[PDB]
Symmetry: C4
Subunit: 481 residues, 4 copies
């Protein structure tokens, strides 16, 4: 009867569900974190460069930034090897021990043109210069300083093979200038001095990139490093960093022939429900119409295919075209080739999420629960459209926050970051130490009221409007009895 | 029909709402924070002055305070420029790079007269001296020390152009004495030594101000600095600081002619509803009477006008009268001219808040929500007058806290600060580390009971008295069905 | 009618309530905290004694303890004065500036007798010595070391004028030995060297006290210092400290003649309701019987009288008998004379607490609230006797905690401290960082379950059993309608 | 009547309950913690070895690990004695003062064989070497380096008397190599240099153990030390530590003859209910069937017996066979002999837990509570089987977390650790500082939704489905009235 068509479609998913759980552990090993954490804490937190305590994370002046380069990464990457002996002049070194350095770092940068901003008429004698915020129309393509080599010659975004980048305050694209690093300590050390001497950080500097990347021999894993040091147009500094691990070559002779052969099974397996599912979509137009459970049944397929192509289609031929392209003393473009990885990694996962809530309807046939799932199903039609009312007053304080503290407390800063903090307080966590220090009459009265209302309103609408309906429907499933 | 008069009044507000959202982003840029954070962490947290770790925030002795002045700000403000060359003897320098120093710092101070307090009769031989807490009748106008220059000559509050100030423990007004700083490092460095040598910090010193201010060339922004170092009458020290950014000249040739021309639209736009709304106020006396929604409809106008004048009326002619007044080597009074800014900034924002809850009644016409808004509308008549009962027992622990821990734990300190902590614990956050260390039999028994009752009473009254009414009214809107 | 007898009794309390609110602010000023915080952070957190970072709070070895004495307090108390000149050989100094040192410190100590514990028979050759935990029957009165001066001669508890003390692990009484400090730096510095040389800290040392005290000239306030450094019988060290501020002389010529004259009014005012209230107690035996509101009406009087005598009766004649007793170069006993202050301070406050909940019944006559106070009045008869059921399972985890983590995590430590942590987690706060590090299979499974049940049981019993009754009684006050 | 058989069985448990409460305090004293905390903070947090701040907990490089051994523990264990005199050449020393060192430390280690992993074909010329993750089939038994002494000769797991170990990433068994330490500072110091010189840490090193142990003369307590320093296969380092206190000799002449004589009473007392309880189990098969209260009545016995034997049966003859076995200059195996202690300690406690909830049914006969216990008894039949639905969506985010942040934030790391964090956030505690820094578009949207749903779903199902039933049953016990 049905049970054959019940389990058969289940048996697919029931078997299909284990497939990805393999990929999880399989495509990404569990200790991968302790790869970063090391690789992280090497180049971030640990200047001994002097008694100076300030690490990468804590940084202000530009000259420190110099002392950072030539004082840490310069000693981070370029330095001796395990035996100290046996004369390696071809691969001269890597960091230490179990990780391989490949290529050579690339320093990328932006700048904005002189007098891009007109000082108000009054001060025009008082001070000569102005450099305003970074923007496309404000970007500077003009050649610069003593013009020799690359970093003294502007280049187009498309000229380099690199892409744009997100960043925190201002998004950046292409390069104003760049310098690829030498593979030897000395010359790298030799440039930086010769590099500082010309001072291309003078003013108006905005984006500053440092890009190298490395390989792990042991578990094969392949990781990239982008250090972006922003400069606000107001004179400060914002440090930031991005560490992305990646597996490049898809084939590990041990476990992958199980995985990759199951990989092709996966894209085949969905190809089944690709067409199988559309048949009801084309044949029954309104039968699937107006079902949230069903309206979500498509999304899993929507996303999966996106993942499907981009891995092979985008990134497979990539992997090929780097062989000697990637290995030579020259530095590859590889970053953008991993751009999709992050793009992929999450959207790989996001699907996996929904895959469970698929089973949510199915294999719970048993108790009154199956009915008592309709209970929770009933509520939202009130609340799903209701939550605005709260969320309206919820944005209230949010925007009330920005305008008030936004110039002093950090946590609020933008509006996009300060929307969260008024969550993080509801669960609780506290900058309230320095809220007073911000504005004595306000920070109290904002906070005091907010925790009062929001934490005593969330009570109100939710719980009751939760409570009632269930009491009704559980009594309603009693009033069919 | 109505829909014409419905949308027309809406279209005003519906358009009016976007107007201010412009001002928000427009009148204050988003990165303004990263202006302070730099400008902050320069003069606060970062002595290298010796291996001494203690920054401004962590400070005790008076001689450190000296080592602070001549050791940090002295090197904070007065120091070299980007090229190090090209001979600037007119503007000799600013801090670094992208921020301009203007004027010159001013050190302001208070003191209290000798023997202002009568030691009890017994000890009168034991010790000679007494200086009691700062207060007006206890203030000292008497000339002091070797009398030369300004800071050895008292001045009246009105004599100087400055105003009073809030501060934490004691509010302060005017000046006992003052010294304007030199614009050169050396002479500033030269004074302080000559300044210490006379030791005008001897004892009884209470308020100590340091005031300079600076300008930002790049985005035009104009910021002021008040460092107040209090001295308790018990011998300690309280550091504190105030950083206020400001835009002064109202005209940025780029975006402002959009903003300022929309500014005049704004004050015009309210002028519409200024009179339009009073017509019903004068004609219908009792028709608007007794409506909370309507009773709040006035407040938005009440505040806005306050903001309206004070910006132009108070502060516009200000901006004018500083041109060469502000630029010359002499230091301006500008602080009070920004006093209203903070006064303004918030009260600008507070309105914006209410502007949303205006729409709260209007554009939700749709679901039973519009009715289900009457639900939440029903509750408070019980609770709004009820919340005292809690709040009564709520102050209980509060005042129970002060009398008990108030002499040992900091967090409680005053009553005004300790009213909050018994919130900050309900959401949760913890000094409970050192609560035991305060009083072993109490700190437990206060805390233990409090979290018990308050966190199990807030349950009680709220949720039920929330729950019921909705169950009734939702059934009442069912019992009109 | 009643309103005359209604307000008259009220007018007493209604006026009486303000009386104590004066005492609060009056008997204890608001800035008193910033007295300690200074006076605290001088002798606790701030060795510069070398580059060694370890302060008082962080301490291990005994020799550090030596370097603490002679390296900090030795420089804490004994050191120069404001002018550095004018030859004070009578009062040679105080700390700095605004606080007076009086008397001279006293070092007090305990020790336990040799071989107080019998090592098991096997090891008896392996190692010679044993010293067990401190206890009365294990206490050592035997004279000790080279016997000269005080600290080499035992003394009885009663011989010294001092009392016992609480402390954390073991309570202590009297003295094994003691040394009063010199008033001069040098000799104090001279002893300690001569003191170390004899090494009376050898082993078995348990309690170590350091006691001096100081006076504040300015606001008159009088503070005492007890530093107890425990030694566990296992070789460690436990630092601890006690700072008690006090006002001694009851008369400040300015504000006290208002306060003290109102003080005598207070003890008179209660003397009114002392007898006035007993009349109904004697005449009506069962009329007051079985009323919680009334059953609490006595407690306020119970405690107040306790406070009444002990201030004058215990501590007034004290204040007198210290005049030249307290001032002379010899050190007074004053500590115990302040013992009652803390004993008093709280029990002064605890009353004040209840004084509000007195008004709780009275001046709320108005809304249905007065009836709706009976609502909350109804609940507890279920819950007040119920809370055991939870509290039973609540102790469960508590004692489950001790036996499990108690030997590794600090936070649990005793049972008396670990009863709190399972609150502090419910509100939330976290050692959960090192819970895993303690026991990997447990710390999770304890924690995981606990937050599950306890935080999902507190839901259960409370809210519903809260909700229902009110829904009933509010409907019951509706069913009298 | 019943009351005789009611109390008699009670009187057993009612008396039995106190028995174990003795064991708690008795078998483990309260200050035992302050034994560890000292003994802990000696060898963990406190290098002065140079100005280098990095302690054991904060560690990266291998050479630091060397500087750790020879720089801390080398000075931790081996160093002078109280008198500095009286010539102890037999027991040469212990740490300090009140703790005895016995035996001598043992360094244990693992390694993995060369070329255990085949580098992909392409790079095979690029780099020569590979060492993959530790596993049994990947373990290396091959002899190593210059082969002399123990640590240059492999040994089997069974050859040594030691057992395997848990550890965090990889579990370890037996030894690749080992070296017992000398009892003298010098020779221990002498080896390490000679030890480093051979460099047996070269690469592929995984597990590194250091094992010594010590005795406490004073309270008799006997503690063991295992320091495991893991090496990831990716080049990092993971420090970790295990401190286990233990009492070995069961007889303390003072209090134990009360305890141990009550110990034999205990195992006798259960032997009563061992058989007494089985009689109803054999005679009534279905009468006990299907009672949760009764279904739990067996577990207490199930576990207790497990504890019963293993203490005497496993560990008693152990204690005997160490007398001169344990004392001699040679180092004993004692660790595994304490392996059961931890195994025992918890499972000793876990029983004690359930012992209370035994009384939960009994001595509450009194109020409607006894009936109102059936109320809470009613709920779970809905919820106990329900909690999956939540817990399903609960794992959702959990696994959604791993795949997303798992490569950057530490807190998530494995799946087994990241299941907790989504609790620790619900109660609240925050890495949300660096969540943004991980993935800007995700970390918000994960977090934002999660706190929304999970914290607004836990509301939903729980409270109502809690509320209703009680309202029904309390009305149902009213509808039997
Ligand atoms: N077999 C997978 C584990 C899960 C799949 C879902 C059903 C339960 C078992 C697999 O992920 C196991 C692993 O990767 O180690
Ligand atoms: N136009 C404003 C954005 C909001 C206004 C309210 C309606 C939705 C859109 C403006 O603030 C946009 C900006 O300042 O960038
Ligand atoms: N008059 C007191 C303030 C309170 C008393 C209670 C009624 C309201 C006013 C007094 O404490 C004021 C003061 O001490 O400053
Ligand atoms: N006699 C035990 C105390 C408890 C037992 C249970 C009933 C209440 C009293 C014993 O643990 C006391 C002690 O160990 O100090
Ligand atoms: C170009 O290279 C020469 C080589 O010495 C160097 O001196 C010069 O600085 C470079 N470019 C400029 C603009 O100086
Ligand atoms: C006044 O100026 C002179 C100039 O040298 C200086 O010496 C003196 O200290 C100043 N005033 C006093 C009171 O000393
Ligand atoms: C007693 O005083 C003398 C004075 O020099 C001192 O040497 C001695 O140490 C003191 N007591 C003992 C036991 O040494
Ligand atoms: C064996 O012992 C000798 C003794 O000096 C030492 O030199 C040698 O290093 C040891 N083993 C090896 C492999 O070197
Ligand atoms: Ca909560
Ligand atoms: Ca919380
Ligand atoms: Ca916290
Ligand atoms: Ca809640
Ligand atoms: Ca209900």
């Amino acid at each position: 009867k049905y049970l054959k068509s019940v389990l058969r479609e289940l048996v697919t998913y029931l078997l299909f569900l284990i497939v990805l759980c393999i990929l999880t552990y399989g495509m990404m090993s569990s200790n991968v974190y302790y790869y970063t954490r090391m690789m992280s804490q090497l180049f971030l937190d640990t200047p001994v460069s002097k008694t100076e305590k300030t690490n990468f994370k804590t940084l202000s002046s530009m000259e420190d930034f110099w002392k950072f380069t030539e004082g840490s990464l310069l000693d981070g990457l370029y330095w001796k090897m395990q035996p100290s002996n046996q004369t390696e002049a071809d691969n001269r070194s890597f960091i230490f021990y179990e990780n391989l350095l490949l290529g050579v770092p690339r320093i990328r940068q932006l700048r904005v043109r002189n007098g891009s901003c007109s000082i108000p008429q009054d001060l025009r004698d008082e001070i000569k210069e102005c450099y305003d915020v970074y923007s496309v129309s404000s970007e500077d393509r003009a050649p610069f300083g003593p013009r020799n080599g690359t970093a003294w010659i502007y280049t187009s975004e498309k000229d380099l093979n690199g892409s744009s980048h997100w960043g925190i305050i201002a998004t950046y694209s292409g390069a104003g200038y760049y310098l690829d690093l030498s593979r030897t300590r000395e010359e790298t050390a030799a440039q930086v001095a010769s590099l500082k001497k010309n001072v291309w950080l003078d003013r108006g500097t905005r984006a500053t990139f440092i890009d190298f990347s490395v390989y792990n021999a042991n578990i094969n894993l392949f990781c990239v490093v982008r250090l972006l040091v922003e400069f606000p147009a107001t004179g400060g500094v914002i440090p930031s960093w991005q560490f992305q691990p990646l597996k490049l070559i898809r084939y590990v002779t041990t476990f992958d022939f199980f995985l990759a052969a199951c990989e092709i099974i996966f894209c085949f397996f969905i190809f089944y429900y690709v067409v199988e599912e559309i048949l009801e979509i084309r044949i029954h137009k309104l039968h699937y119409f107006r079902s949230f459970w069903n309206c979500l049944d498509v999304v899993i397929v929507v996303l999966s295919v996106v993942a499907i192509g981009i891995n092979i289609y985008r990134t497979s031929n990539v992997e090929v075209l780097l062989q000697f392209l990637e290995d030579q003393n020259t530095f590859p473009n590889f970053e953008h080739l991993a751009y999709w990885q992050i793009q992929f990694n999450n959207i790989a996962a996001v699907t996996v999420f929904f895959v469970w809530i698929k089973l949510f309807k199915f294999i719970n046939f048993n108790r009154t629960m199956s009915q008592l799932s309709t209970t929770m199903s009933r509520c939202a039609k009130d609340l799903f459209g209701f939550a605005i009312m709260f969320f309206i007053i919820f944005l209230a304080y949010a925007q009330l926050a920005y305008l008030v503290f936004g110039t002093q407390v950090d946590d609020f800063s933008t509006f996009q970051e300060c929307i969260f903090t008024q969550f993080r307080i509801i669960l609780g966590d506290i900058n309230f130490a320095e809220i007073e220090e911000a504005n004595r009459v306000l920070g109290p009265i904002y906070f005091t009221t907010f925790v009062f209302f929001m934490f005593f309103i969330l009570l109100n609408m939710f719980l009751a409007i939760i409570n009632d309906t269930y009491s009704e429907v559980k009594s309603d499933l009693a009033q069919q009895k």
